[PDB]
Amino acid sequence: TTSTAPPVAELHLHIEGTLQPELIFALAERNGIELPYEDIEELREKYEFTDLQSFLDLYYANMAVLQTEQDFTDMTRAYLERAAAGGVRHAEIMMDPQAHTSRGVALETCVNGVANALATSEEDFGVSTLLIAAFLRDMSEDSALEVLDQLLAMHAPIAGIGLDSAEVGNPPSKFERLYQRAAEAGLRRIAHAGEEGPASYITEALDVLHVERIDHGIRCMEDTDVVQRLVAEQVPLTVCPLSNVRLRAVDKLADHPLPEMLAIGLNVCVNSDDPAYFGGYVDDNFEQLVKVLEFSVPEQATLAANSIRSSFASDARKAVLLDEVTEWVKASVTP
Ligand SMILES: Nc1ncnc2[nH]cnc12
Numbered sequence: 001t002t003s004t005a006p007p008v009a010e011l012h013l014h015i016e017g018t019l020q021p022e023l024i025f026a027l028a029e030r031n032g033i034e035l036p037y038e039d040i041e042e043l044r045e046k047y048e049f050t051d052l053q054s055f056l057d058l059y060y061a062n063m064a065v066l067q068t069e070q071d072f073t074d075m076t077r078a079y080l081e082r083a084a085a086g087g088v089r090h091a092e093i094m095m096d097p098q099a100h101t102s103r104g105v106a107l108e109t110c111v112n113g114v115a116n117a118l119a120t121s122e123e124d125f126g127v128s129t130l131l132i133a134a135f136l137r138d139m140s141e142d143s144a145l146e147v148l149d150q151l152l153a154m155h156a157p158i159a160g161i162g163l164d165s166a167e168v169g170n171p172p173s174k175f176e177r178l179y180q181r182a183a184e185a186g187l188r189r190i191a192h193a194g195e196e197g198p199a200s201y202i203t204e205a206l207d208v209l210h211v212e213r214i215d216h217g218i219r220c221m222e223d224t225d226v227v228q229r230l231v232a233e234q235v236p237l238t239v240c241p242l243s244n245v246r247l248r249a250v251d252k253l254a255d256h257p258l259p260e261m262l263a264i265g266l267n268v269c270v271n272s273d274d275p276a277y278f279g280g281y282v283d284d285n286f287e288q289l290v291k292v293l294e295f296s297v298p299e300q301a302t303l304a305a306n307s308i309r310s311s312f313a314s315d316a317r318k319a320v321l322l323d324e325v326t327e328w329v330k331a332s333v334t335p
């Protein structure tokens with residue numbers, strides 16, 4: 001038996017969702033920004049969410065303290081540091097370029113800020129990293145295409161493209177052009193689907209957008225033969241247990257489909273999504289899965305190895321990490 005988390009890769013994580021209330025107040029201070037909260041207690045008080053939207057509102061509001069390159073670097077390093085301590089061996093990190101350019105902050109600023117933290121991640125924290133630019137699905141495709149163009153032109157260190165923000169009423173198909181652009185640019189593809197959006201949206205992301213893994217995807221359980229294709233094709237599903245609970249997509253953690261999804265062969269893995277908003281990082285997600293859903297060591301290991309096989313890391317990086325989960329299991333079961 002073990003109480004430690006396994007060596008994993010986090011494939012579903014928003015860097016802006018990594019922003020802890022302490023850092024928010026610190027960056028506000030450094031930028032001489034007045035916050036709409038008397039104290040940091042009044043802030044934490046605002047973390048009871050009702051749906052995806054109520055969360056996004058805070059999520060976007062908090063980004064206001066991110067002004068300088070240093071701000072982005074600091075935020076990224078604070079996550080890489082905490083992620084490492086929690087067992088994260090490889091991190092594929094999302095970022096919402098538009099959520100900053102819409103505030104007058106240059107692409108140069110937000111991209112450089114993060115990248116500079118990432119370019120040194122293996123050395124400083126022992127974490128392999130990929131940068132994924134995610135696009136706000138509730139803004140136009142045309143503006144997403146223009147931002148993509150600028151990322152390309154400036155040679156931004158992005159490995160792939162993502163799709164998030166308010167899902168319902170904003171189908172994957174809306175960004176077909178965008179993803180055709182990305183693919184011909186050699187960019188890898190992921191997209192949020194099946195969080196609050198229907199199983200239909202998953203098929204759309206797979207067929208119209210040609211994504212390489214589905215983010216969330218829990219609503220796939222509503223359609224037998226969508227579930228069927230997922231299983232058949234081993235499409236990676238980046239599940240976020242605590243996220244789904246705190247956003248009310250799932251009532252209680254005890255009600256989460258993850259166990260069933262694993263049992264039926266869906267290629268699922270565990271992610272913290274927006275760690276500073278849902279009260280826990282990946283290792284916290286694991287802890288709760290064990291504590292509440294009685295996940296075994298071998299089960300946890302399976303989840304870990306999925307996350308590695310599903311990553312866009314080198315086969316070499318996967319191999320050594322895979323061997324690591326094998327060691328963890330052997331060290332972690334009762335004699
Ligand atoms: N989990 C999530 N779903 C949709 N949009 C998001 N933006 C940040 N995190 C998100």
Ligand SMILES: [Zn+2]
Pocket residue numbers: 012014164192215273274
């Ligand atoms: Zn997400």
